[PDB]
Amino acid sequence: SRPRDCLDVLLSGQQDDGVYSVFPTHYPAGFQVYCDMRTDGGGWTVFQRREDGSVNFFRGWDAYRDGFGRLTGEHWLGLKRIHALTTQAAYELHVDLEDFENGTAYARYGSFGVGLFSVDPEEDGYPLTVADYSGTAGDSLLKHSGMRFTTKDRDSDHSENNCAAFYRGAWWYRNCHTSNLNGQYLRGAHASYADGVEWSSWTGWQYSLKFSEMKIRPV
Amino acid sequence: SRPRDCLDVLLSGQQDDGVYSVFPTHYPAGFQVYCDMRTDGGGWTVFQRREDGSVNFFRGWDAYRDGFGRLTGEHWLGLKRIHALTTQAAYELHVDLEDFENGTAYARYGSFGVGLFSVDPEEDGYPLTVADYSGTAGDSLLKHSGMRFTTKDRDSDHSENNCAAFYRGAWWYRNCHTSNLNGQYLRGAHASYADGVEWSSWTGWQYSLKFSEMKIRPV
Amino acid sequence: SRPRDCLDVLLSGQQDDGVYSVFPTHYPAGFQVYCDMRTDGGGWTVFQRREDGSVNFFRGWDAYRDGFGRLTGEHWLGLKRIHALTTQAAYELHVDLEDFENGTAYARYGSFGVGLFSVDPEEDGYPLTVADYSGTAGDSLLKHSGMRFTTKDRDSDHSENNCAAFYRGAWWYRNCHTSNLNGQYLRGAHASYADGVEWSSWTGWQYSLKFSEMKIRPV
Amino acid sequence: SRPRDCLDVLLSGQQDDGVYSVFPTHYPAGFQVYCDMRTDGGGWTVFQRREDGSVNFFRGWDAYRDGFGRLTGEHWLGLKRIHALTTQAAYELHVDLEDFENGTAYARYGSFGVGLFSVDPEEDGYPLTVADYSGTAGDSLLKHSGMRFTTKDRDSDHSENNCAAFYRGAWWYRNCHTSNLNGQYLRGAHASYADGVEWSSWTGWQYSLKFSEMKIRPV
Ligand SMILES: *[C@@H]1O[C@H](CO)[C@@H](O[C@@H]2O[C@H](CO)[C@@H](O)[C@H](O)[C@H]2NC(C)=O)[C@H](O[C@@H]2O[C@@H](C)[C@@H](O)[C@@H](O)[C@@H]2O)[C@H]1NC(C)=O
Numbered sequence: 112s113r114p115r116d117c118l119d120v121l122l123s124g125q126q127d128d129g130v131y132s133v134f135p136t137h138y139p140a141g142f143q144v145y146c147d148m149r150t151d152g153g154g155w156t157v158f159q160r161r162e163d164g165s166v167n168f169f170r171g172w173d174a175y176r177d178g179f180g181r182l183t184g185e186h187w188l189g190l191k192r193i194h195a196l197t198t199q200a201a202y203e204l205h206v207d208l209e210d211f212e213n214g215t216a217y218a219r220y221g222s223f224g225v226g227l228f229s230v231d232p233e234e235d236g237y238p239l240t241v242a243d244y245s246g247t248a249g250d251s252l253l254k255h256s257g258m259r260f261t262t263k264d265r266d267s268d269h270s271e272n273n274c275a276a277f278y279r280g281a282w283w284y285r286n287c288h289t290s291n292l293n294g295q296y297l298r299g300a301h302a303s304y305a306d307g308v309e310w311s312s313w314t315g316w317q318y319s320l321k322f323s324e325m326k327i328r329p330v
Numbered sequence: 331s332r333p334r335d336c337l338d339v340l341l342s343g344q345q346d347d348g349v350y351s352v353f354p355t356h357y358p359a360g361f362q363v364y365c366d367m368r369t370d371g372g373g374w375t376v377f378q379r380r381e382d383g384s385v386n387f388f389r390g391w392d393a394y395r396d397g398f399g400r401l402t403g404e405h406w407l408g409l410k411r412i413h414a415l416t417t418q419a420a421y422e423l424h425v426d427l428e429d430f431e432n433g434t435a436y437a438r439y440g441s442f443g444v445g446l447f448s449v450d451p452e453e454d455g456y457p458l459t460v461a462d463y464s465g466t467a468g469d470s471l472l473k474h475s476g477m478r479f480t481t482k483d484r485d486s487d488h489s490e491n492n493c494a495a496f497y498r499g500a501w502w503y504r505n506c507h508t509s510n511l512n513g514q515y516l517r518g519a520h521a522s523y524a525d526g527v528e529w530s531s532w533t534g535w536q537y538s539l540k541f542s543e544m545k546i547r548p549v
Numbered sequence: 550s551r552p553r554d555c556l557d558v559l560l561s562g563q564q565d566d567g568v569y570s571v572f573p574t575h576y577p578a579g580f581q582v583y584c585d586m587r588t589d590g591g592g593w594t595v596f597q598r599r600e601d602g603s604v605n606f607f608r609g610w611d612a613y614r615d616g617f618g619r620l621t622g623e624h625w626l627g628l629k630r631i632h633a634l635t636t637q638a639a640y641e642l643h644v645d646l647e648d649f650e651n652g653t654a655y656a657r658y659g660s661f662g663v664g665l666f667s668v669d670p671e672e673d674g675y676p677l678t679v680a681d682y683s684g685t686a687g688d689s690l691l692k693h694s695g696m697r698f699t700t701k702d703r704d705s706d707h708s709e710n711n712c713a714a715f716y717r718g719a720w721w722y723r724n725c726h727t728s729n730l731n732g733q734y735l736r737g738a739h740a741s742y743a744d745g746v747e748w749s750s751w752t753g754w755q756y757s758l759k760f761s762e763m764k765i766r767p768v
Numbered sequence: 769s770r771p772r773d774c775l776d777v778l779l780s781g782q783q784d785d786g787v788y789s790v791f792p793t794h795y796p797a798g799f800q801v802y803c804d805m806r807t808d809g810g811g812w813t814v815f816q817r818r819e820d821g822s823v824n825f826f827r828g829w830d831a832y833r834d835g836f837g838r839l840t841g842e843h844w845l846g847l848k849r850i851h852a853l854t855t856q857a858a859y860e861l862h863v864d865l866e867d868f869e870n871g872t873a874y875a876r877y878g879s880f881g882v883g884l885f886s887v888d889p890e891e892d893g894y895p896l897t898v899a900d901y902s903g904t905a906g907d908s909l910l911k912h913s914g915m916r917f918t919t920k921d922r923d924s925d926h927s928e929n930n931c932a933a934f935y936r937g938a939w940w941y942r943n944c945h946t947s948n949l950n951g952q953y954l955r956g957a958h959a960s961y962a963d964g965v966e967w968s969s970w971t972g973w974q975y976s977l978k979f980s981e982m983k984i985r986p987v
């Protein structure tokens with residue numbers, strides 16, 4: 112009765128999409144998550160969802176560490192929880208996207224982790240590990256591999272300015288991004304440059320997507 | 331020997347009203363609570379009690395998060411503990427009231443929860459879920475459903491001012507309240523408007539009740 | 550292998566005085582304590598020791614909450630740990646004293662607790678419960694029963710001034726004390742009034758004792 | 769499946785050098801460490817590594833308490849973790865060194881601990897216990913036995929100045945050091961006095977070593 116993630120939940124015989132308790136190896140108090148039990152056989156732990164612009168994603172370091180929003184709607188699970196999940200086994204990442212024309216695409220990454228070898232993942236800036244792309248959305252994440260997480264109030268990017276401030280989001284920014292899924296909910300085509308919910312490989316630098324979901328499952 | 335609430339305590343063969351250790355799913359350190367083993371067959375976990383005005387209830391955010399008073403007297407268990415209890419199963423709420431003429435009434439709610447789907451219940455303001463009224467006191471809580479918790483130093487209400495400051499309490503204020511059980515212990519009829527221990531549906535807007543107890547049990 | 554106190558350690562077959570790991574009900578991480586396995590059959594958990602004046606006891610709230618000194622020498626275990634121990638069962642208190650003439654005396658209290666019913670024992674000031682005196686030192690603690698703990702930087706006493714500042718210690722001060730075992734190590738008779746390691750019932754108001762040990766065991 | 773250290777990992781049949789989860793007695797959440805499964809039969813828990821100067825070691829108290837760097841490279845595990853490991857059993861210390869001429873030497877200490885009897889190891893300054901030298905590097909640590917840990921922002925040394933500031937490191941400084949393995953990565957011979965990665969007994973006061981590893985195993 113102590114599943115470590117949504118795959119453990121599924122394999123214990125819980126087949127319905129919804130909110131479940133999980134207990135990562137180094138987070139034994141555990142916490143609630145949204146489980147996707149449908150995509151590619153199910154067992155995905157959601158850590159990010161955009162769908163309606165109801166939640167402010169232009170938040171500081173503490174909010175991105177601790178999480179915000181609601182599991183049933185738009186949310187960010189929190190980097191401390193994403194670290195606890197991704198360090199306990201080898202995980203893949205699934206990213207579901209939707210445009211405002213009801214077009215959908217996905218990106219799959221064979222390996223995904225946050226601060227995997229960091230003694231203090233918070234001080235080390237929750238650095239991204241990501242490799243092995245496949246899917247229909249194209250790759251907009253591999254160039255982010257190795258980058259620390261940057262917020263408007265904590266700059267660990269490779270730009271002379273703050274990428275999070277400039278592109279109004281929070282991400283593993285380099286100089287600055289190919290993806291920006293925590294960017295502003297600008298609702299489709301926008302004149303502003305690359306500061307919406309962007310996945311450059313699918314819809315370019317000036318299209319804020321309607322829906323994103325980022326979720327993990329052990330390989 | 332790890333009951334999750336006062337019902338687990340009762341069903342393990344502890345029939346006496348009093349203080350017991352409970353261990354919620356996501357609060358495994360556990361904590362002590364007052365158990366009501368009498369009301370409607372027993373197994374109720376108390377989280378609020380007014381009885382004599384001996385404890386200051388006009389407290390800030392941190393006090394309402396962490397709890398205050400004593401389990402054997404006037405107390406608030408703390409929103410972090412009420413979140414830990416109400417997210418681990420489906421709970422009902424029982425509210426016992428007494429006026430200064432030894433009149434008593436109660437309100438029962440078939441569903442009750444605090445920050446049930448909140449990634450960070452503290453940042454999300456411990457929002458109230460409450461439905462399905464029955465009893466003798468009348469309903470003074472259903473209009474509060476969906477509201478965040480507001481204190482004198484943290485305003486998440488739907489008023490242009492701070493409802494907690496204005497009505498000298500701490501509650502899931504809208505604009506502003508039908509109930510105010512954490513209000514001032516003004517002892518019966520008062521000239522001041524709605525700033526005492528108010529349950530509007532029973533005793534109106536200018537009567538501070540002698541006794542309140544708010545308690546939960548799994549359905 | 551999870552003893553809750555020094556009595557559990559003793560009954561598991563550890564007969565030697567020394568440092569052991571204990572795991573109180575609501576402090577499951579556990580911590581190390583000094584166990585007295587000799588006094589009245591053994592199984593006493595030490596929480597205070599004076600013996601040489603090597604450790605500064607004139608410390609603030611945080612130090613008295615979290616503890617200081619070393620388990621093998623002069624120390625204060627910390628009110629958070631003393632709360633965790635005394636709330637998990639019914640404990641007695643033993644107080645061993647020594648003067649500078651190698652005279653010894655003790656006080657035994659049939660009941661002892663710190664913040665026993667406090668929702669937040671820290672905010673409630675770790676109030677003392679103590680009753681049922683017997684021994685050779687006389688009673689210098691029963692008048693302290695019901696008092697919150699006062700430090701130089703947090704005044705919860707019944708004096709118009711700060712008793713901890715005035716008598717250079719930290720205690721469940723009333724107005725102000727009959728005992729002051731966390732007072733200055735003034736080494737025997739002193740001109741200053743009641744600001745040393747005082748046990749008034751044995752050695753009066755102007756004698757700083759050489760040795761004190763305060764320790765607990767379940768009845 | 770809850771090894772307390774790298775020796776428990778080894779004896780469970782994990783023979784490969786690498787990163788593993790360990791669960792110390794009083795740190796039950798556990799954490800990841802680098803295990804050396806080769807040196808003198810294996811089972812060593814690494815807590816310090818220098819190899820390339822890629823990580824800043826001139827850090828403050830909080831960084832030395834909580835840890836920094838990466839387990840696969842240069843890192844400091846953190847004094848809170850080193851306290852949790854060394855208080856749960858009797859440990860020996862192994863120190864591996866390398867100069868820039870591919871010369872190697874080691875120091876072995878039959879006993880090693882950090883804040884072993886400290887009620888609050890952080891407030892007590894994580895004092896060093898170390899005894900019983902043998903090896904090829906010579907002894908540069910025994911004179912540090914009994915000293916608290918000093919950083920540039922927290923001075924507990926026996927110098928009139930701050931040893932950590934003066935020798936640009938963080939250590940159990942006396943007045944001031946025979947070893948300085950958290951000093952600046954100055955890369956071999958340097959004109960500056962004793963402010964590099966120094967092991968005085970092997971390479972003197974003006975030679976910053978290429979590689980250091982500090983690791984522990986139960987005797
Ligand atoms: C894009 O998908 C949407 C979600 O399924 C469609 O809206 C939904 O249409 C349902 C019937 O298919 C209807 O019951 C739902 O109420 C509605 N959902 C929402 C969120 O509005 C949408 O369909 C268009 O809009 C609706 C309201 C109807 O007028 C349809 O005829 C429209 O095509 C899809 N959009 C397009 C452009 O196809």
Ligand SMILES: *[C@@H]1O[C@H](CO)[C@@H](O[C@@H]2O[C@H](CO)[C@@H](O)[C@H](O)[C@H]2NC(C)=O)[C@H](O[C@@H]2O[C@@H](C)[C@@H](O)[C@@H](O)[C@@H]2O)[C@H]1NC(C)=O
Nearest residue numbers: 380381382383427428429430431432433434518539540541
């Ligand atoms: C309202 O209920 C109160 C609590 O039961 C009553 O007071 C209690 O009366 C007991 C005998 O019934 C007595 O032993 C208790 O000491 C007392 N409790 C307290 C808290 O005072 C109260 O009764 C009135 O007051 C008491 C002191 C007597 O004088 C009675 O004759 C009074 O009726 C009840 N009040 C009324 C108005 O009935």
Ligand SMILES: *[C@@H]1O[C@H](CO)[C@@H](O[C@@H]2O[C@H](CO)[C@@H](O)[C@H](O)[C@H]2NC(C)=O)[C@H](O[C@@H]2O[C@@H](C)[C@@H](O)[C@@H](O)[C@@H]2O)[C@H]1NC(C)=O
Nearest residue numbers: 599600601602646647648649650651652653737758759760
């Ligand atoms: C009070 O008790 C002390 C602790 O036992 C005595 O000192 C100890 O005496 C031991 C022999 O009995 C000796 O081996 C210890 O080294 C010594 N301990 C310390 C802490 O000094 C003390 O005895 C007096 O002082 C010692 C040094 C001798 O000179 C004795 O002859 C003295 O009586 C006791 N004091 C008195 C006044 O009896």
Ligand SMILES: *[C@@H]1O[C@H](CO)[C@@H](O[C@@H]2O[C@H](CO)[C@@H](O)[C@H](O)[C@H]2NC(C)=O)[C@H](O[C@@H]2O[C@@H](C)[C@@H](O)[C@@H](O)[C@@H]2O)[C@H]1NC(C)=O
Nearest residue numbers: 818819820821865866867868869870871872956977978979
């Ligand atoms: C000191 O040890 C180093 C690590 O083993 C040597 O460098 C390594 O040499 C390997 C072949 O032995 C080679 O495959 C590795 O790429 C290389 N590692 C690194 C980190 O460079 C080093 O050997 C000297 O430098 C290398 C590049 C060659 O030119 C050798 O001929 C050199 O001797 C050793 N240094 C000395 C002075 O022996």
Ligand SMILES: CC(=O)N[C@H]1[C@H]([C@H](O)[C@H](O)CO)O[C@](O)(C(=O)O)C[C@@H]1O
Nearest residue numbers: 270277278285286287288289304305316
């Ligand atoms: C959103 C984003 O990161 N855009 C960045 C672009 C693109 O990387 C480039 O056009 C390749 O598409 O490069 C810069 O102009 C640049 O190199 O100075 C910085 C700018 O921040």
Ligand SMILES: CC(=O)N[C@H]1[C@H]([C@H](O)[C@H](O)CO)O[C@](O)(C(=O)O)C[C@@H]1O
Nearest residue numbers: 489496497504505506507508523524535
């Ligand atoms: C205690 C309380 O909340 N009273 C509020 C009342 C009642 O809601 C209303 O009289 C229905 O009974 O409405 C207001 O006057 C209003 O709408 O502007 C605000 C006031 O704060």
Ligand SMILES: CC(=O)N[C@H]1[C@H]([C@H](O)[C@H](O)CO)O[C@](O)(C(=O)O)C[C@@H]1O
Nearest residue numbers: 708715716723724725726727742743754
């Ligand atoms: C150490 C101590 O508390 N002394 C206190 C004494 C004794 O309580 C009293 O002499 C009975 O022995 O009373 C006071 O003088 C007083 O009542 O004003 C205050 C003073 O702080």
Ligand SMILES: CC(=O)N[C@H]1[C@H]([C@H](O)[C@H](O)CO)O[C@](O)(C(=O)O)C[C@@H]1O
Nearest residue numbers: 927934935942943944945946961962973
């Ligand atoms: C690195 C270091 O600690 N050097 C110290 C040296 C050596 O201890 C001494 O030369 C023995 O080798 O002593 C001092 O000069 C001294 O005593 O005043 C202080 C100086 O900080």
Ligand SMILES: [Ca+2]
Nearest residue numbers: 266270272273
């Ligand atoms: Ca930057």
Ligand SMILES: [Ca+2]
Nearest residue numbers: 485489491492
């Ligand atoms: Ca407001």
Ligand SMILES: [Ca+2]
Nearest residue numbers: 704708710711
């Ligand atoms: Ca006072």
Ligand SMILES: [Ca+2]
Nearest residue numbers: 923927929930
């Ligand atoms: Ca100094």
